[PDB]
Amino acid sequence: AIPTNFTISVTTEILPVSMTKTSVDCTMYICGDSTECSNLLLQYGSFCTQLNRALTGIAVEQDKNTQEVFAQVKQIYKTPPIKDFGGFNFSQILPDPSKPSKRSFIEDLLFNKVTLADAGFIKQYGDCLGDIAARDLICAQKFNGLTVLPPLLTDEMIAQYTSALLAGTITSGWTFGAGAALQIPFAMQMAYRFNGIGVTQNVLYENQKLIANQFNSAIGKIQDSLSSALGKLQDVVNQNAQALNTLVKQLSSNFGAISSVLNDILSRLDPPEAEVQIDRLITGRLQSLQTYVTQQLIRAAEIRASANLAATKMSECVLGQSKRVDFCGKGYHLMSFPQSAPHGVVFLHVTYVPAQEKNFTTAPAICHDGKAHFPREGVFVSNGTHWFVTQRNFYEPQIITTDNTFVSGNCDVVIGIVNNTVYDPLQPELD
Amino acid sequence: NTLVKQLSSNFGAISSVLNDILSRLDPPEAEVQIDRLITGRLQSLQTYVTQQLIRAAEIRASANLAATKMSECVLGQSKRVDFCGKGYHLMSFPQSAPHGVVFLHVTYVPAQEKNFTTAPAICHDGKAHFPREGVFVSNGTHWFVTQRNFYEPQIITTDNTFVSGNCDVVIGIVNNTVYDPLQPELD
Amino acid sequence: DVNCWRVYSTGSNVFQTRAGCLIGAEHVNNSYECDIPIGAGICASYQTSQSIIAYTMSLGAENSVAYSNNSIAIPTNFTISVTTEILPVSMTKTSVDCTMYICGDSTECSNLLLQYGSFCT
Ligand SMILES: *[C@@H]1O[C@H](CO)[C@@H](O[C@@H]2O[C@H](CO)[C@@H](O)[C@H](O)[C@H]2NC(C)=O)[C@H](O)[C@H]1NC(C)=O
Ligand SMILES: *[C@@H]1O[C@H](CO)[C@@H](O[C@@H]2O[C@H](CO)[C@@H](O)[C@H](O)[C@H]2NC(C)=O)[C@H](O)[C@H]1NC(C)=O
Ligand SMILES: *[C@@H]1O[C@H](CO)[C@@H](O[C@@H]2O[C@H](CO)[C@@H](O)[C@H](O)[C@H]2NC(C)=O)[C@H](O)[C@H]1NC(C)=O
Ligand SMILES: *[C@@H]1O[C@H](CO)[C@@H](O[C@@H]2O[C@H](CO)[C@@H](O)[C@H](O)[C@H]2NC(C)=O)[C@H](O)[C@H]1NC(C)=O
Ligand SMILES: *[C@@H]1O[C@H](CO)[C@@H](O[C@@H]2O[C@H](CO)[C@@H](O)[C@H](O)[C@H]2NC(C)=O)[C@H](O)[C@H]1NC(C)=O
Ligand SMILES: *[C@@H]1O[C@H](CO)[C@@H](O[C@@H]2O[C@H](CO)[C@@H](O)[C@H](O)[C@H]2NC(C)=O)[C@H](O)[C@H]1NC(C)=O
Ligand SMILES: *[C@@H]1O[C@H](CO)[C@@H](O)[C@H](O)[C@H]1NC(C)=O
Ligand SMILES: *[C@@H]1O[C@H](CO)[C@@H](O)[C@H](O)[C@H]1NC(C)=O
Ligand SMILES: *[C@@H]1O[C@H](CO)[C@@H](O)[C@H](O)[C@H]1NC(C)=O
Ligand SMILES: *[C@@H]1O[C@H](CO)[C@@H](O)[C@H](O)[C@H]1NC(C)=O
Ligand SMILES: *[C@@H]1O[C@H](CO)[C@@H](O)[C@H](O)[C@H]1NC(C)=O
Ligand SMILES: *[C@@H]1O[C@H](CO)[C@@H](O)[C@H](O)[C@H]1NC(C)=O
Ligand SMILES: *[C@@H]1O[C@H](CO)[C@@H](O)[C@H](O)[C@H]1NC(C)=O
């Protein structure tokens, strides 16, 4: 069964790259503003130092992840003013030069589907004073020593990196990932990529308009499907927020003491009897911080594996053409385009799909004069009465000639050989 | 060293020294202090072992990656981009290092580029000719076929291209002659 | 958490970034590679008289490709390059004597600790 038509399909893949960076003030969480509790807590300083070392390790690893995914190339390419790409329209994934953020249309759609817990990192003391505290969750966190640190690269820098990658791929093919960028017309690059899945160039050059229309329609479908999906990127936000709020809620546990309020214990009890209750509370709250830090470490390990996978995809699907099955989408991989998303990356994989199949009878070899002829790079098929040779992935019948097959042995060994004539296109010219 | 330093914590006991507690206190009153110290030191050991487990998992991932590199870069030639260095991978050599491995990746880098005008096909006699495995270029006046990654110009012949269809469909076809290197010999 | 006052000292060189208020650093209009990351794109360094300077980190050089619809670029020479990659493979192996760490040579502490043997195992 040989396909007769094709389909050009664009699919999306979503990957998380980084998580929220956090820091803890140990004394602020355990004791608040009680001097006596701090003097009692001075016996456990090593544990707070150890917890902070673990958190800072996680925090620097997050920036390393983002650097490894997005900052591969250090040349910031610019897209040409003339958009003459053989009828392919990349306007939906190129940066809009009029919005404040220089983001593409699809990136703008993606950024409105993930809602960050807090926008901005400057919440002033005067902003939440009195009622607003203990009602707004961020201020409740911040009055107990729990702070969120901003990432090193802003959204605009990552958008710049993705736009540089896109301009490189559509102006220079895959050469800019191996060295200096070498310019090439876009249709000739498309013909090279068709050569790389086993389809001859003339198929692309004859069907160029159909292929361009299919690509444009697929991009339009992607756009119309996003303005209507990103759970992998929302669950990271939800998990970090939930962990911080659970730490804030666990401050109402007695742990076997008379009360959970230090000020209630410090009044009504003298130091020798207040010390044992404060000690119980201190042990419980150190355990809560330890549990939080351990689960943060395990989550950071998972995010690191995801970011390594994203870097490998960026290298092998965007900066080249991949032959490993299902790594860069479903079908024969043609090319990929990256887009930045909040805390992650989206890949647009363009692949080739065989469309309409027809049935033929086939044979391994042809027996002409006691010789066995085999196809050089095709397959032998029959429409019922006549015998042709074609290519495996597209139906393009041709007459069997000697410049088209090769001989090996006689006809006594091949199991299913058939009888037919081989043109040998020299005899007419010699005559 | 952090485990050794954490032995000076009281954990809410009178002292952190067992011998100091065992003298000056009788067994029924020394038992509660010793119990506090025991609980604290078991917690320290537990924390150490947990962080060792997480670090061991990270080292295991790194070692799996190193084994894959040894198989695919040293025992073969890899076509996946940037796995075995920057550029077209040629070969790799391993060297041992304390607690690790170093790979020496030899790769090929294209050096000096020149500009040419190009065309998808050639129209000879109402036929369209396409390169078998090269690209069509022009120095300004003449047309040659070359290979993509190195410049080695050659004359366009029929043993060098292949025909498909007429010249009415290919967008940017150009007019040139195809040698056909048999006619002189037949004459 | 200050927009430039809840500060220890004001001094001079008060500079506002999206990471917060920075005091004690001079702001320059250049863009170097990042030495010490401050955040939100801002980096710091110690330069030339010597002083701490704060700047916006550069992402790299900007070069535009000369694209046309009938123009190709072919390499004429090559280079053979050898590069190195370093990978960790193993870590230190350790063992702990639980009784030696918790009790030392105290017999009484060991008799008390006999209630927790499962955890050491
Ligand atoms: C191969 O498939 C394409 C569809 O992907 C066919 O093109 C369509 O043809 C119908 C009518 O034949 C038109 O109504 C559609 O608008 C066409 N689609 C596009 C995108 O232009 C094409 O005709 C098929 N070719 C063969 C030989 O079957
Ligand atoms: C490329 O795609 C864009 C987006 O679909 C096209 O611009 C649209 O053109 C239609 C009319 O055909 C307008 O109604 C839309 O408002 C346009 N959108 C935008 C964002 O401007 C564009 O015409 C296509 N072709 C080219 C060559 O760019
Ligand atoms: C199998 O293919 C052969 C060869 O192409 C077909 O024979 C051609 O049929 C057309 C239509 O009648 C004629 O115009 C050609 O002159 C025929 N060529 C030859 C060499 O005879 C044949 O029709 C096909 N068989 C079937 C069952 O479709
Ligand atoms: C383009 O290439 C042609 C063909 O090689 C060059 O023509 C040759 O030029 C040399 C130097 O003058 C002569 O010795 C050869 O006899 C020429 N060959 C032919 C077939 O005429 C031509 O010089 C090149 N054009 C440019 C602008 O460099
Ligand atoms: C610090 O406060 C200043 C003063 O209000 C802020 O500057 C304003 O920012 C808003 C936000 O878009 C603008 O609409 C105002 O026009 C700005 N006013 C002036 C005078 O610049 C500034 O945003 C604050 N700093 C930070 C980091 O949030
Ligand atoms: C290709 O590049 C090499 C350099 O990598 C060139 O060889 C050098 O040539 C210069 C003078 O032309 C000598 O001084 C160097 O010592 C050579 N290098 C080596 C390693 O031998 C070579 O000439 C270039 N070839 C072309 C055609 O440009
Ligand atoms: C090929 O033949 C099988 C056998 O009946 C049939 O089921 C199948 O539909 C045929 N394929 C096409 C494309 O007609
Ligand atoms: C195919 O099967 C038929 C019987 O159904 C048999 O006669 C014929 O020799 C077989 N051909 C091959 C190539 O196996
Ligand atoms: C092919 O031809 C040979 C001799 O011409 C004959 O022996 C053989 O049976 C033929 N194959 C058939 C009829 O399938
Ligand atoms: C190729 O042409 C472009 C267009 O001006 C030019 O910028 C570039 O330097 C040229 N390449 C070489 C190697 O001269
Ligand atoms: C290249 O662009 C020119 C206009 O700048 C146009 O006339 C020519 O037909 C184009 N050729 C191809 C192959 O697109
Ligand atoms: C190529 O030749 C054909 C006929 O010889 C002519 O119609 C066509 O215009 C030519 N192409 C040019 C002049 O670009
Ligand atoms: C930096 O640029 C701004 C505006 O472009 C200007 O006001 C300021 O004086 C400049 N700083 C220096 C040191 O030149």
Cβ–Cβ contacts within 10 Å for residue B20, how many? 12
Backbone angles phi, psi at A123, to 5 degrees: -110, 110
A164, containing H or E segment: helix A155-172
Cα–Cα distance, A241 to A143 (Å, whole number): 16
Cα–Cα distance, A238 to A231 (Å, whole number): 10
Cβ of residue B154 lying under 6 Å from some atom of ligand 4: no
3-class DSSP state for residue A97? coil
Q: Who's near A414: CB < 8 A, 6+ residues apart? A: A364, A365, A372
Q: Which of B86, B76, B149 is nearest to A315 (CA)?
A: B86
CA distances from residue A70 to A65, A155, A311, B92, C41 in whole angstroms, order as listed = 9, 12, 8, 27, 15
Whole-number Å distance, alpha carbon A157 to ligand 13 midpoint, is 22
The type of residue at A203 is V
Cβ–Cβ contacts within 10 Å for residue B32, how many? 12
Contact B178, B156 (CB under 8 A): yes
Strand partners, B131: B161
Contact B82, A314 (CB under 8 A): no
Cα–Cα distance, B147 to B136 (Å, whole number): 9
Question: How many Cα atoms occupy the beta-carbon half-sphere of B144 within 13 Å?
Answer: 15
Mutate to test the pocket of ligand 5, among C2, C14, C16, C18 (most ligand atoms within 8 A of CB): C16
> Pairing state of beta strands A361-363 and A379-382?
antiparallel
B56, containing H or E segment: helix B27-69
Q: Determination method here?
A: cryo-EM
Q: Which of A165, A164, A123, A158 is nearest to A141 (CA)?
A: A123
Whole-number Å distance, alpha carbon B141 to ligand 6 midpoint, is 29
Nearest CA to ligand 2 atom 9: A91
Cα–Cα distance, B21 to B27 (Å, whole number): 10
Mutate to test the interface with A, among C67, C69, C70 (most CBs of A within 10 A): C67
What is the chain A residue with the closest CA to B159? A403
CB-CB under 8 Å, B87 with A205: no
∠ CA(B72), CA(A62), CA(A96), 5° rounding? 95
Cα–Cα distance, A175 to A183 (Å, whole number): 9
A89 alpha-carbon distance from chain centroid: 23
Whole-number Å distance, alpha carbon A188 to ligand 4 midpoint, is 27
Cβ of residue B115 lying under 6 Å from some atom of ligand 10: yes
3-class DSSP state for residue C47? strand
Question: Measured from the CA of A367, which atom of ligand 9 is nearest?
Answer: 1
Contact A140, A251 (CB under 8 A): no
3-class DSSP state for residue C5? coil
Cα–Cα distance, A93 to C18 (Å, whole number): 28
Cα–Cα distance, C39 to A124 (Å, whole number): 18
A51 by Cβ neighbours in 10 Å (0-12 / 13-18 / 19+) ranks as buried
The set of long-range contacts for B12-18, using a CB threshold of 8 Å and a minimum separation of 24, is B12/A43, B12/A276, B12/A279, B12/A282, B12/A283, B12/B36, B13/B37, B18/C103, B18/C104, B18/C106, B18/C109
B139 alpha-carbon distance from chain centroid: 37
3-class DSSP state for residue A361? strand
